[PDB]
């Protein structure tokens, strides 16, 4: 009935960030993971297994079992013509057993003598290879069109892919239906968050994939043309007229105001959606925002608890004969003055399984994959001081638990056979870290800071202290580029852009204390400006090289090394894009960051380094060159200061 | 399709020879690394391994096990007719999980005893020969004609040797066209530092491998007489015209201030690179260079963090059961004044691993494999005083983390250890003073010193021949691109001249190249400013020119150069310290009165 979708999951996709497992007599167990959305049904499903069993292997003792949601699915015993050999296996799933969250698990049972044997022996390894998959086929339901569930056919949270959501316009947008399409990106974004973000724009044409059409009584698209008049912005979740298994998501209003106002209420009012249509009356913004209170970011009002942090639950405890680490994402504003602070104070109140004599197992603190320090388990709450040089916008705080496992084997005489206990380990939701007594001060212009958690415009979550300037009919590329770089912010903050701005006259602007983001081309009067360090033209562009480019400096900007030494004007008809930040002529505490491209290609590349979160990742400095190599940044120009230091850190810091 | 290259790789930890690698309980592991051109995949791999099990090993369950990126790529089991008897074993290698960086790694699984096992028995040993490597089959490819990837085809960062770069001309080059072949020269030596740098020159020959082409629109070489006239600077990346896996760059002008443009469009202008042809409009300098900012030396401006010193993130930590040795690169400028303070201070911060109860456990400090000091790790902060007499040359800061690892019959997994050395360790040399007697080629040989105090080469005017042949545009070439490798930064302000008469009464260092080979360098003070210098490059055959500039690239040769003079001839290098000897600097008239005193 429906449409069928075919997709291999190779191990070294979905599998632990080698991709390969070896599977021991000590660690016999090894898992890969995969969702399945809430409108489609796995039909077919296929574990391709590569995998080489140790030699000195009892062969029909020895098996692997592969596990479905802890269902045996089949059993592999290991035939002696594949001891110390390469196997293919091929072991048929049962669909019926697969749930909005499966787990598939391989556990290795191994015997090397029909004698007294140690578990632990080395010689008892199956290596699976990176090269094993799970071939499965998806099938499309055709849900109904029921507004609860409202996200749900559009953005999955069972679904760990990139949320791509067309979005339909009439034409080219006015200013206010840009505004309400990037309030809509914003939320989809906050609600996608990790997954990604990718936001097609057609004009006037119907997709192939579930999207979110925008209609005006007066500008309306060519299927929409006998849809009747409205009153009142109303959302519909109706059927694409060709393809019943693709939901359309009609946002309608009598103008642009009722297009915002419908926007709005998918921003702010979706825990009420029901049925197949929805009218939204009134949203009323009671309280405003304040700044540094997104929600995905550590709140600086007091210390935050490390169940704040955690995700979901049973996140902070681990069990097992070697527990896996455990991971804690710390997302902190940006613009935190650390390059003072002799380190950061956590307090952490850690729970486990004590060996039973005294040996070499410990737990290690590390940060960011650097090793801070370590605790021995023979030996509260413990006192913990982290380095502030290394505490960026986005970290990770990792708990290894080194066990040591000291199993007797008796004496050559007599031997004994144990029954491994695996161990227990939890850190406390009553651990906590503080990040309350430092203030707010950024060596700006940061493209590393834009680029991990849209600084300048995530100062205030909503936006409300944000314009952005579009060009007065903007094509696709440049719609594409504003909705993605809309959602990646609303992604990094977890909430709606519901306050943000958008001008077209690129002169309104003057005078105005906003934070500007320039998608279309710097306008004229910011052209000449002496800050801009890189302008692409149609062909022509030139850049400001700095002095000199260390690899690892230090947070302290070092304005002698950023000075600009040279400036190269080049022309070629090959595609480049940049982002540059600089430091906004009509306010000192501002900042204007600024998206460019030269031609589709170059604006294909921008919304590619984008959306794609590693690439945005190697983003800093003031300039960031995206070429088809990749991503080049510079460390060059003047250095502002935003933020506010009081004179009491300034006179006890002027004395050393 | 395309030209085919077999290496031949050996394990890297290995052993002094005439030892050999052997494999025990304790770190029964064996890597070998290699990096991958963009513009090579590898056809067919092999593992040869010649090694010799210990005869007291139960034979199969005792393996050997090949990994390639974390990948088993196979197992070799011990047999009963291989015990103690050396064996000759190949293992396949797949191609298709090789990547940019790779890894291949061999591990030993040792076994003598069913039950009650010492994993630190003395039984327990596998020696691998040295003729046990790796054997690969690289094969070019037809790479896209994208400046985007600039550099890729002509240095690729990624490849170890010595990077070989055919400049190409149509004639006897004006003085225009050899400073910016100079510039060219110069930050392609930057890009390739400490691998060596060889500029062949062809007049109207096309080479077989990359290449830079320098042409004009009156003087084209003659497989160039079909390009439109430009009426700009432009530099294009071209197919070679009988081999597509060749690649050219053109570099293309109205004249000689045209391929000027050009090449400092090059030097600087490279993140702008994109297309099979860009056009340089402007190249306008904002800002001089201050003497000793080459990117390659340490900072003399303030105290230099750990962090500075670093080539790539994670250098300064390292894990395992035997955690590896830290290493630190030192460039100092060859000018610093030691001569009065017994050494450099350290700071340093450092986190380990504690050992369950105190042992023998100890990290010791190592400058150029010579063992400076040791400290036991029992508890971490370190202050440290460092001699300074290696000057010029690179200098490597080991830190050696050695864990006693005590043992706790009964079976148990060995715990790893983490070492961190810290970013915020400060090395100084701000508070220093510049002073060295100049006549002295060792500082040449080490980093240009005469004309590396200025990274740009401002303060320097080179002298060439009026119509100069291949060899001797090609010391020019080897001298500038040595010079950039030493400094890390292009030589765009160098100044070349074709007659001796414009150095008269100007305050800028000479280089000077000029004419049974004979090949002479010869240093003395210029006779128109007491703080400057003359270095002559001459040599009379141009088999002499050849020697010469092997000489001049060789780290070996360079590191047998002293004195004043060095005389090259087949016989060996030959250098005696002759004339008067002169010293270069501002010391203060106090601290020079302290100095005699002392």
Redesign the interface.
């Known amino acids: 009935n429906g449409p069928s979708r075919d997709v291999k999951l190779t191990f070294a996709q979905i599998a632990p960030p080698?991709?390969?497992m070896?599977l021991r007599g000590?660690n016999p167990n090894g898992s890969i993971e995969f969702g399945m959305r809430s409108d489609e049904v796995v039909t077919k499903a296929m574990l391709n297994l590569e995998y080489?069993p140790?030699?000195?292997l009892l062969p029909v003792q020895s098996q692997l079992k592969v596990y479905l949601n802890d269902e045996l699915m089949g059993v592999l015993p290991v035939t002696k013509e594949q001891l110390?050999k390469?196997t293919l296996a091929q072991m048929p799933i049962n669909p019926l057993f697969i749930t909005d969250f499966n787990r598939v698990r391989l556990e290795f049972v191994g015997h090397?003598?029909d004698?007294?044997?140690?578990p632990?022996?080395?010689?008892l390894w199956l290596?699976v290879?990176?090269s094993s998959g799970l071939d499965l086929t998806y099938q499309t339901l055709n849900v109904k069109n029921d507004l609860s569930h409202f996200p749900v056919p559009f953005f999955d949270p069972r679904d760990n892919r990139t949320n791509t959501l067309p979005m339909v316009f009439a034409g080219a947008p006015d200013v206010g239906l840009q505004q309400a399409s990037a309030i809509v990106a914003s939320w989809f974004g906050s609600r996608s968050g990790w997954r990604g973000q990718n936001f097609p724009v057609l004009y006037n044409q119907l997709p192939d994939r579930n999207a979110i059409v925008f209609a005006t009584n007066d500008k309306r698209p060519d299927f929409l043309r006998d849809h009747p008049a409205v009153k009142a912005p109303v959302i519909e979740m109706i059927n694409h007229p060709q393809n019943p298994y693709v939901k359309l998501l009609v946002v309608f209003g009598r103008d642009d105001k009722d297009l915002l106002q419908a926007a709005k209420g998918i921003a702010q009012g979706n825990i009420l959606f029901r049925g197949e249509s929805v009218v939204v009356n009134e949203v009323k913004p009671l309280l405003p925002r304040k700044p540094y209170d997104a929600p995905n970011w550590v709140r600086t009002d007091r210390p935050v608890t490390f169940g704040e942090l955690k995700t979901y639950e049973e996140q902070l405890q681990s069990s097992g004969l070697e527990p896996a680490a455990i991971n804690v994402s710390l997302n902190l504003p940006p613009d935190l003055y650390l390059m003072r602070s002799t380190g950061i104070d956590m307090d952490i109140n850690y729970r486990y399984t004590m060996p039973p004599?005294?040996?070499?197992?410990?737990m290690?603190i590390?940060l960011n994959?650097?090793?801070?320090?370590?605790f021995?388990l023979?030996s509260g709450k413990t006192d913990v001081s982290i380095?502030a040089?290394?505490l960026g916008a986005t970290n990770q705080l990792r708990f290894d638990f080194?066990?040591?496992?000291?199993?007797?084997?008796?004496?050559?005489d007599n031997?004994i056979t144990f029954q491994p206990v695996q161990n227990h380990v939890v850190i406390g939701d009553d651990s906590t870290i503080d990040f309350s007594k430092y203030y707010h001060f950024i060596p700006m212009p940061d493209l590393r800071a834009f680029a991990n958690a849209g600084f300048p415009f995530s100062r205030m979550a909503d936006l409300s202290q944000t314009i952005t300037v579009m060009p007065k009919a903007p094509n696709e590329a440049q719609m594409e580029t504003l909705l993605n770089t809309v959602g990646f912010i609303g992604a990094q903050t977890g909430f709606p852009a519901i306050n943000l701005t958008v001008t077209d006259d690129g002169s309104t602007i003057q005078g105005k204390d906003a934070d500007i983001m320039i998608i279309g081309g710097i306008p004229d009067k910011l052209k000449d400006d002496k800050q801009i360090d890189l302008l692409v033209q149609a062909t022509?562009?030139?850049?400001?090289?700095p002095?000199?480019?260390?690899?690892?400096?230090?947070i302290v900007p070092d304005e002698?090394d950023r000075?600009?030494?040279?400036?190269?004007?080049?022309?070629?008809?090959?595609?480049?894009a940049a982002v540059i930040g600089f430091q906004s002529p009509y306010n000192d505490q501002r900042s204007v960051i600024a998206l460019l491209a030269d031609s589709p290609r170059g604006y294909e590349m921008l919304n590619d380094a984008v959306n794609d979160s590693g690439k945005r990742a190697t983003m800093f400095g003031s300039v960031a060159?995206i070429?088809?190599?990749?991503i080049?940044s510079?460390r060059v120009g003047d250095v502002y200061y935003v933020g506010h230091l009081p004179w009491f850190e300034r006179l006890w810091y002027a004395l050393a």
């Open positions: 080698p991709g390969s070896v000590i080489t140790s030699p000195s110390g390469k090397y003598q004698v007294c044997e140690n632990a022996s080395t010689t290596d290879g990176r004599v005294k040996d070499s197992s410990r290690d590390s994959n650097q090793f801070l320090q370590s021995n023979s380095p040089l290394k080194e066990y040591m496992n000291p199993m007797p084997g008796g004496s050559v031997c022509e562009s030139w850049v400001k090289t002095m000199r480019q260390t690899p690892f400096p230090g002698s000075a600009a030494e040279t400036r190269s004007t080049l022309t070629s008809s090959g595609a480049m060159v070429r088809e190599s990749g080049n510079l």
